[PDB]
C-alpha cells in the first residue's frame, strides 16, 4: 500500500498508487549546464538505490541523480578528481577526455560502457555495483562498469569488447523467455572475453509489466551476486565456470 508522487518533466504532478512489487518512490533529476534542470518522479522497484553520475561532454556538464525512499509520498519533497567524456559528442571515442572534480566525498570515478543510451560515459558518481567493476556480454550486448576511488583512476583508452581477448571459456547466449528467446534451438555458444568467464543466466522481469525475462552470456564474477545492466527489475542470477554449463539444462 505505497503511494508516490508521479511527476512528468513539465511539472504535471499527481499521486500514484504503487503496483505490487514497487515498494519505493523515486525522484530522478537531470541538470544540464553550459543551467537546465529536469525532475521526474513515480513509484519504483524494490531494488532501486540512490545513485549519481556526472560527466562533461565538451562545454556542457550533465548531472544525473536518483534518490529513493519507501514512505508514503516521500517523493514530494525537493574532492576526488576524475576523467570525464561522453559518446553524445564523440568525446570519449575521440580521446578528448577532460578532468572533472567530484563534489561529494561519496562519488567515485566511473567508466561505463553500454554497447547496444550513450555507448561510453566517464565521470563522477556512484552506481549500483560500484565498489569495483563488472562486465557482461552476449549475442548482442556488452556492458562494463568500472568504479574506483583514486585520482583519475578511470583514465585511459576507452574499453571496447574487441580489445578484450577470447579466454577459451564458452557460454550460451540468448534473451527473452525460456520458451521464446532462450530455447535449446535459439541459444548458442559464444566466446567469452577477458575477465568474463562466468557462464551466466539472469531471470527476472523486463518490458512494461512483470513479463518474465531471461538473459544468458559471459560475465565477470562480480555479476553473480544488478539488473540495470540487463534492463530488468528483480534479477535472479546463476553462474558456473564450465564451458556450456550455461545451457537451458
Amino acid at each position: 500500500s505505497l503511494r508516490c508522487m508521479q511527476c512528468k518533466t513539465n511539472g504535471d504532478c499527481r499521486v500514484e498508487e504503487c503496483a505490487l512489487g514497487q515498494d519505493l518512490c523515486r525522484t530522478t533529476i537531470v541538470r544540464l549546464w553550459e543551467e537546465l534542470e529536469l525532475v521526474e518522479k513515480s513509484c519504483t522497484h524494490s531494488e532501486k538505490t540512490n545513485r549519481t553520475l556526472s560527466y562533461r561532454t565538451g562545454l556542457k556538464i550533465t548531472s544525473l541523480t536518483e534518490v529513493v525512499c519507501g514512505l508514503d509520498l516521500c517523493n514530494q519533497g525537493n574532492y576526488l578528481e576524475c576523467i570525464s567524456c561522453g559518446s553524445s559528442d564523440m568525446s570519449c571515442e575521440r580521446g578528448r577526455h577532460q578532468s572533472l572534480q567530484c563534489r561529494s566525498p561519496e562519488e567515485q570515478c566511473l567508466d561505463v560502457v553500454t554497447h547496444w543510451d550513450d555507448r561510453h560515459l566517464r565521470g563522477c558518481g556512484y552506481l549500483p555495483g560500484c565498489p569495483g567493476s563488472n562486465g557482461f556480454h552476449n549475442n548482442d550486448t556488452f556492458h562494463f562498469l568500472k568504479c574506483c576511488n583514486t585520482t583519475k583512476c578511470n583514465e585511459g583508452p576507452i574499453l571496447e569488447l574487441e580489445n578484450l581477448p577470447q579466454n577459451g571459456r564458452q557460454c550460451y547466449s540468448c534473451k527473452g523467455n525460456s520458451t521464446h528467446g532462450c530455447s535449446s534451438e535459439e541459444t548458442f555458444l559464444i566466446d567469452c572475453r577477458g575477465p568474463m568467464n562466468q557462464c551466466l543466466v539472469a531471470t527476472g522481469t523486463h518490458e512494461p509489466k512483470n513479463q518474465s525475462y531471461m538473459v544468458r552470456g559471459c560475465a565477470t564474477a562480480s555479476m553473480c551476486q544488478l539488473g540495470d545492466a540487463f534492463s530488468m527489475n528483480h534479477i535472479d542470477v546463476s553462474c558456473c565456470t564450465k564451458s556450456g554449463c550455461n545451457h537451458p539444462d
Epitope: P165, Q166, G168, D191, G194, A221, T241
Partner: antibody, heavy 118, light 106 residues
C-alpha cells in the same frame, strides 16, 4: 614485489604422477589468470592451460586435457599443476605465468624442471 | 587452430645488421606479442600488443603487423640480442610460434 614462486626440480619415475606449485605474491591472486607452459629440452613453448580464482574455473589445451590438472589453494595464493602417467615426453621445464593487465604473459615463474626417470 | 609460423628458423646476423623476424598466422589475430628467451630460462616479455616495448627493452627493437602477419625488427643487431624469440597470439589458444634462434654471425 609481484612474482610467481615455483617449487623445486623433480625426478619422477615413469608412470607416476607429479604436482608442482606456483606461489603468487605481490598482487591479488584471485583477479588474474595463471597460465602453465611446457618446454621440452631444446624445443618450443606449449600452452597447457589456465586457472582463474579457483580449481573450479580452468581451461585446458586439448592436448593436455588428459595429462594435466590445474588447481589452486586460494588461502595461500598458490596454483598447482598435476601431471600423471609420466613418460619421457613429459620431461621438461614447466613455467607458470600471469596473464597481466595488457593481456600478455607479463610475470613468469622461474620454471620447474621435471625429469621422468627410473 | 590458428597456426603460427615463425621465420626465419635460425639466422646469424652480423653486429650492426638489420634483423627482421616474422610470424605468419593461419588466421587473423588482433594482437601479437613477442618474448625473448636465453639459455632455456624464463621467457621475458619483449614486445606486447604488437608494438609496445616491455620495460628495459632497447630502442633498437620494434614490432609491427596486423591480421595475419607480424614482425619483430632489430634495426642494429647487438651481441646481447642473441637469443630465441617467440611470437604468441594474445588470445585463447595462446599458441607460441616455433621460435627464431638469433645468433651472431662472425
Amino acid at each position: 614485489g609481484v612474482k610467481l614462486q615455483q617449487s623445486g626440480p623433480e625426478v619422477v619415475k615413469p608412470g607416476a604422477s607429479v604436482k608442482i606449485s606456483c606461489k603468487a605474491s605481490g598482487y591479488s591472486f584471485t583477479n588474474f589468470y595463471i597460465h602453465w607452459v611446457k618446454q621440452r629440452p631444446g624445443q618450443g613453448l606449449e600452452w597447457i592451460g589456465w586457472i582463474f580464482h579457483g580449481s573450479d574455473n580452468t581451461e585446458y589445451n586439448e592436448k593436455f586435457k588428459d595429462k594435466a590438472t590445474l588447481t589452486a589453494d586460494t588461502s595461500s595464493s598458490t596454483a598447482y599443476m598435476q601431471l600423471s602417467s609420466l613418460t619421457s615426453e613429459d620431461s621438461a621445464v614447466y613455467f607458470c605465468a600471469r596473464w597481466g593487465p595488457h593481456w600478455y604473459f607479463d610475470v613468469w615463474g622461474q620454471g620447474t624442471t621435471v625429469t621422468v626417470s627410473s | 587452430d590458428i597456426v603460427l609460423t615463425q621465420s626465419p628458423d635460425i639466422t646469424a646476423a652480423s653486429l650492426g645488421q638489420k634483423v627482421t623476424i616474422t610470424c605468419s598466422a593461419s588466421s587473423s589475430v588482433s594482437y601479437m606479442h613477442w618474448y625473448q628467451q636465453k639459455s632455456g630460462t624464463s621467457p621475458k616479455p619483449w614486445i606486447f600488443e604488437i608494438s609496445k616495448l616491455a620495460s628495459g627493452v632497447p630502442a633498437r627493437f620494434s614490432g609491427s603487423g596486423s591480421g595475419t602477419s607480424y614482425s619483430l625488427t632489430i634495426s642494429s643487431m647487438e651481441a646481447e640480442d642473441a637469443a630465441i624469440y617467440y611470437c604468441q597470439q594474445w588470445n585463447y589458444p595462446f599458441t607460441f610460434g616455433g621460435g627464431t634462434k638469433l645468433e651472431i654471425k662472425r
